[PDB]
Every structure is written in structure tokens, then in C-alpha cells.
Symmetry: C3
Subunit: 329 residues, 3 copies
């Protein structure tokens, strides 16, 4: 088959790709490097992270149904842990986990066939209690497998997006020193038992988009124009989320994230099941600031699950009008 190398782009952006397959089935070559480092989640909150390619989430890989994926996965000798990769996109051997367990100072090359259209989680799954821990330390990302024929809608007609953003949501369980401030550690394995106690409560301390509170606000703010049709790909590897575009809708929404299923239309809020990725297409009609949230508003605001979209274009007063500005009684 033809082979194609890919240069990965950190999220929320996506490496170049076609929607409808230009050619026939190819072998997609990706490479990633595992990086264990301490990341900042908030004003005063840090995480002993473990990443695919330095980012939470790991980067978006894009392919077409029928392609193959050949990934060189590498674990640099400065890392303290073994790691692997389970693609929910793949069939066999625990999604590839049973063939990619590599130690600090090793590499592995896995190939699988993308038989199934949709967005899918990939995450590290070293075995036993290492599974939850590596994932809640950030080791998860997404792979989107587009139908060859491009995206189809509910009645089977083509739909094309102008922009895909990859929203990687992730829940984290930072333990606290006695003083009620968040603990810091020199390495992950040092933080282990304290993180466990927090995990067993099933209450996350943080829940963030693209790695940290406010990561997709401020200079990280997502961008678009009125008339833009944007695909929002949203992953949650360990815990449910309920995405909502404040001031918008999901025009077409595959909440279970698999493109040969009919999308739902006109959604206020949709549902991403822990261990999955979903996709919502929206065409912006109104300019201005939007928020993209997890709509448990405690999770959106106290925990970190809020992104911003800045949209320019022409205001349409038909859709919305302030008839009487805030005047006194």
C-alpha cells in the first residue's frame, strides 16, 4: 500500500487531512514519545502527569475507514514507568495494549486496521491498578476515523466541516497536604498512594479541557466566523461529560461518536460517556463570545470544564434582539 508519514499537531488543532479520502487505503505512520512531567492544572494546583507527546490530551490522529495505522511508540529512559497504548479504534489484544508494553528506554511499532468509522479514545493501560492511574495522570488522546465517503448526515447527504477542534476533557484527583492545599511531589510514583485515596472517592479535584483550567480561554480561546461549520470532537477517557455550547446548539451530534450511526439534531446538551469520544457539528449564526462547557456547572466552573469560542461576523437581530436595554423600574 502507499505509506504516509504524519506530523502531529498538539490539540485542540489537528494535522492536515482530507475529509473524503483523496486516494484508496494507505498505511498511516504516526510516532509518539511518552513524556512524564509535572504540569500546572490551576493557579495553585499541579499534577504528576504522564503524556503521549507532552500534551493532555495526547494529539489527534486522523485516518479514513479502511486505512491502517502504524505507530512507533517510544518511552525515553528518563521516564520512571512502563507504558503502552490501547486504541479503542483497534481490534485484538486489548486494543493493542498487550503488544505495546515498553520500559523506560524502549520502543515498539504496532499496526492495526481502522475497520470502524468514528472518533475513538486511545489511552495507556499498563495492567491492573496502573490502568486507572496512568489515565487519570493524562495518558489518553483520540483517534478519528472518517468514512472514506466523508461525513454523512441523518438522511445520508454529505456534510463537510470547515474546522475540527479536538476538546480533550480529563478528570484528575490531586491529593491535599493536611493544610488543605494541593500536594506536590518530585515524581509520579511518589504521588501514587495519596492520589489513590482521592480516586476511591470518585470526586475529581479538577476536570479540564486541553490540560488545565482556562487552557482554552484567554489566548487559548477557540476561533471562528459566522457561517463557519465547526466539528467539536470531545473525549473523556474515564468519566462522563455533558457538553453544551452556550449561545449555540449541536446541529448534528454523534454523542457516542461513531459516524455510520444517524446523528441527532438541534441538541442543547449532549453526553460523552467515560471511555469514549463524541462529535458535534455546529454552524455559527451569531458573532461574539461563546462558552463550550461540561454542563454540570459545578464541573464547568469550579473544576475547570469551560472553553471559549470567539466568533466574528454579522449580528442577525432576527434571531435575537435586546428590545429594551436594562432600564430601571
Amino acid at each position: 500500500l502507499p505509506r504516509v508519514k504524519h506530523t502531529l499537531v498538539p490539540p485542540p488543532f489537528a494535522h492536515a487531512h482530507e475529509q473524503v479520502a483523496a486516494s484508496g487505503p494507505v498505511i498511516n505512520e504516526f510516532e509518539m514519545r511518552i513524556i512524564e512531567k509535572e504540569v500546572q492544572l490551576d493557579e495553585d494546583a499541579y499534577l504528576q502527569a504522564m503524556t503521549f507527546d507532552g500534551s493532555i490530551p495526547g494529539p489527534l490522529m486522523i485516518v479514513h475507514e479502511g486505512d491502517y495505522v502504524e505507530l512507533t511508540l517510544i518511552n525515553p529512559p528518563e521516564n520512571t514507568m512502563p507504558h503502552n497504548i490501547d486504541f479503542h479504534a483497534a481490534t485484538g489484544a486489548l486494543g493493542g495494549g498487550g503488544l505495546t508494553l515498553i520500559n523506560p528506554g524502549e520502543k515498539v511499532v504496532l499496526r492495526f486496521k481502522a475497520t470502524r468509522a468514528g472518533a475513538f479514545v486511545y489511552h495507556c493501560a499498563p495492567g491492573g491498578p496502573m490502568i486507572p492511574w496512568h489515565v487519570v495522570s493524562g495518558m489518553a488522546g483520540c483517534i478519528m476515523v472518517l468514512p472514506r465517503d466523508g461525513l454523512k448526515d441523518h438522511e445520508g447527504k454529505p456534510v463537510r466541516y470547515d474546522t475540527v477542534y479536538y476538546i480533550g476533557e480529563s478528570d484528575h484527583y490531586i491529593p491535599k497536604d493536611e493544610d488543605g492545599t494541593y500536594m506536590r511531589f518530585s515524581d509520579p510514583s511518589e504521588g501514587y498512594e495519596d492520589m489513590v485515596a482521592v480516586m476511591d472517592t470518585l470526586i475529581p479535584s479538577h476536570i479540564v479541557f486541553n490540560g488545565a483550567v482556562g487552557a482554552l480561554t484567554g489566548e487559548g480561546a477557540l476561533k471562528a466566523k459566522v457561517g463557519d461549520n465547526v466539528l467539536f470532537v470531545h473525549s473523556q477517557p474515564n468519566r462522563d461529560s455533558r457538553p453544551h455550547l452556550i449561545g449555540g446548539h449541536g446541529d448534528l451530534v454523534w454523542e457516542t461518536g461513531k459516524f455510520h450511526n444517524a446523528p441527532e439534531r438541534d441538541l442543547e446538551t449532549w453526553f460523552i460517556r467515560g471511555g469514549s469520544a463524541g462529535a458535534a457539528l455546529y454552524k455559527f449564526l451569531q458573532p461574539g463570545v461563546y462558552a463550550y462547557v461540561n454542563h454540570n456547572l459545578i464541573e464547568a466552573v469550579h473544576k475547570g470544564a469551560t472553553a471559549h469560542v470567539l466568533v466574528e461576523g454579522e449580528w442577525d437581530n432576527d434571531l435575537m434582539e435586546q428590545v429594551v436595554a436594562p432600564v430601571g423600574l
Copy 2:
């Protein structure tokens, strides 16, 4: 366009409306008054509430796809907080939130076009940490936007209900004095920091239908007759729910609440995502007492999420028979 004033009815009832639009697109005029007051949730549990029109949930507004909604929202000078309104039904400016921030002693008139069929949450969203707090103090309600053509079923055939009930479910985070009894405060802003600590645990103290434990039982019991086709509209602005009609089913169910999507049929239990509203139609076949619950039974029973329906009519022994009454071994 023709304009129509509406007099709102507190939930679980609904102001008069037609299913299929009598006329063409009109401008629907609603008015609401924000009321900050202390409400009773349980035997010994109170909440520094903040309401649309004095009720939790805020009242149901009904319109047709293509109409406009013009709401006069009013914040009386005895209220201590600014407030606004975000309709998930609306497009632009944070669902209208960015155009309706009014202080104690002001009003605003917002118009938007109901472009999209379904039931939708509206809630107050003052900005930042005010967003979760105002919502978990009761400031949320629903607006149902019926297709002009009335309700259609899965194969496109019309369906009509004889009764709509609006079930507003709401989660609340009442803090506790040291003695393990629920705290009371003289105003909301006095209760703030104590409520926050509870909110950060993501465990609600109460979860209620129409404002309080047992609010839709006893004299609040919902009512119907065998042969009645009842639409149950159910909102949860901040947290997931799994509604179930004990002794019944959901005949046709839009769990994501948007009417141009095919309903599911024969459901034992459905799923309302936090930040959304859903709708289930049921035709009563058996008379007697039913319970409508959130089917995490700890939430239904220990937290407040239980309503009753009292149904009269003829018992059909074909569907269910006690063959041998409780006799000894």
C-alpha cells in the same frame, strides 16, 4: 406579526396552548419576576432560593417552532443580587445571558426566535462562579417549542397528548452546622461559602421535583385516567437524572428532548443530561398509584426525587393478575 400575551401557570401545570399551531408565527410575550426567598426543601431543610416567578422550577413557557419569544424580565429592588437569563432555546449572546444582566431594581426585554423544536432549559447565568450558584439555588426552568405540525412519532405519524406535566428536577447543596443539622441563613450571599464547600464535593444534599421533597406527592400528586396520553417534560439544569415511571413505560421518549429526532419506544428508564430537558409520552393502561422517580433509588428516596401519579379507570387483568394472594408456606 400577531402578538400574544401569556399568563404563566406555576409547574407542574402549563399555560393554555395548542399542539398544532392554530395560526402562523406570532410574537409570544412572557413576563417574569425574579424572587429571592428562603424555601423549605424537607422536614428540616431550607434553601436560600433564587427563583424565576417564585417557583422551582421556573414556569413552563410553550411556543411553536418559528415563533418569537419576548420576555420582560424584572428584578425587584428587595433582591440582593444581579441576575439574567440564558435560554438554551435561543441563538446568540450566551443564550441571551449577555443582554439581560439586570440589577436589584431594574428590568430588560429580550426577544429571540425559537428556530428549534424541543424542550429546552432556561436558567440564570450571571457570570463566573455565579453561574453554578444561582442555578443550584433554583434559578432554572424550561421552555417547550413544539413543531408547528404538532408532535410526530418515529415513523412520522402524528401523536397528541391529553396532558403535559412539567417535572423540574433540581439538585441542591445545603451545608451543615457542626451538629450535623442543615444550616440556615438570613440571605443567599450569607450562605455562599458554606454552600461552595458542599458543591465542590459534587454530592447534593437534596434532589427534588417541583421544589421540595414530596412536592409532587400527597396533595401535589399528579393525576390521570386509564386511556390518558400524558407528556412528562423533565428538566435537570446541572446534573444527570434517569427518570422511570414505576408500573409504566415511556411509550415514546425524546431523552435529549428535541422533537425532530425520532423518539425511542418501550423504555423502562431514560436519561436526562444535566443542562437539558427531555420528554416522555405515556398512555395509561392500568389504574392506581404510580411513582415517577429518578432511578438511582438513593436519589429517589433519600434525596427527594419521587413523584406520584394517581390514575383511575378500569383494571385489566390480562396485563397483570395476582394468581395466588400472599398465602403461607
Copy 3:
């Protein structure tokens, strides 16, 4: 009508049945015996269980749409509690709960008509706070009502499984002595108030498949061959779950569990709402060990929600290949 006695098989197995109804509507006779006993959940964790037929979950009953179900339910005099049964499959009288409340030393015979196709929860529901408590002590199981015509797929074409496994997931709230070890009691009613405090936190101590941590691993490991089409029926009577077959997919999935609704296809992870049962069909393509998990990985690994499937057959390298084994850098 013809009558048919059934001998129940404990889960995850299923009594013999046909997929497409051999004959016309019959009266299905089942009998169950309530057993209150202490069960082991983990290495050092026990539960004052209350069961249908000695097992968690209660056994799978299978019938066809249009049949009747006549169950003799029996509560032996050594039991300390009254109990009943609510079938979500049934119509009227709180799913049969209002006609089957029997004391220690009594029996009852209930008949209902299975008007509705799908898998459905049945659980004990004695009234008030007894409802959550009996269910979180294990009193719940499932009844699957197959269409007469057998299983149909999304385009209406027949689908047949070679094996049904019944995965009964269940959440439990074991209290702790002061020393942080799990409490033990001599009877259920002795454990009551301590279990309540845990329940009110809505954090389960355990979440298990077929009764106990590791119950469906080791010698309990589920089994199949490449080319086997397996139906996985999955119930959660009180709390949401997100099932995922590690290394596999859900080929056709009724996550709300009702067979006259179109299934979804190609799912990585699906969603079982508390108070319901779902069904996923998968055709094994790759041999080896798979895990079937609740994909909140903290629930899967720290809490007990993990099963194993052992699959033999021929490895297909097209689907997955280890191109370069774990070699050094």
C-alpha cells in the same frame, strides 16, 4: 394457553430458550426463593445480601413478546424481612410490587403479560427507604423479552447470537469500623443505619459483576471462539454504567435495552442507565483475553467492575500486527 415450566440457571448463564418463538404465546412459569445471606464481595469485604434465588444478580428469565409470566415468589421463614418484586417489564401496580409483598414464611403467585420487547430490570421494592436498601443489598435481576420474530438489526434484517451472557452490575455501600476496615454484621437489619450513611454519600464502596470482585475472572472467566456472535446483557438497577469490551466493540448495541428500537453500531463504549438493562452483540474476530469493564476505570479496577472473556481461534494479522517487538532505543 400452553404452559411451560422453567428451570432457572444462575448468571451469567441463561436457561434454554429459542430466539425466534417456536410456538405461539405461552404462559411461562418461573419460581424463585428469596435468600438473605452474607456474601463475600472482595478479599476482605462482606455484604448483608438479600437475593432472588441466592445470586447477585437474580437469574435471567427469558420469554417472548406476547407471552405471560407467572412467577411463584417465596420468602422462607428464616428470612428476617418482607420483600416483593417489581418487574420493569410489567404494566400496573408498581410493576407487580403492590401485589407481591410477602412476609418471612409466605408465598405469592403473580402473572403479567410481556407486552414489550427488550431486557428489563426486576428488583425488590418493599416501600419507602426499604426500596434503595433492598436493591443495594443485591435484590435485583433481569428479564429479557425477545421479539417473537427473533432479533432484528438496524435495517430490519435478522440477527442471531450464539451465546447470551448476563452481566449483572451492582453498586454497594459497605460501611467501615473506625479502623477503616469494612464492618461485619450478623444480619441485614443490624447493618442498616451504618449502610445508610454510606448510601447518602452516593459513593459505592464496591461495584461488581455477578456478585463479587473478580467473580467473572479466573475460573469465572467468560468464554468464546473467533466467529462467535455473543449477546452481552447488562443490568444496573440503581446506578449508571459505561460498558466497554477492551480489544472489541459493540457491533449492534441497544444501550436502553429495548429491541424494537434501532441499535447503534461500532460503539467503543455504551451507557447503561441506573434502573435499566442494555444489550450489546459482538462477533469475535481476534482470539485471546478480553476485558469487559465499566469504563470509569476507577470503578472498573478499584471497585470491582471488570470481567474477562477468553477467546480461542485464529489470529488475523491484517487487523493487528506487532511490526517491531519491544526493542531498545
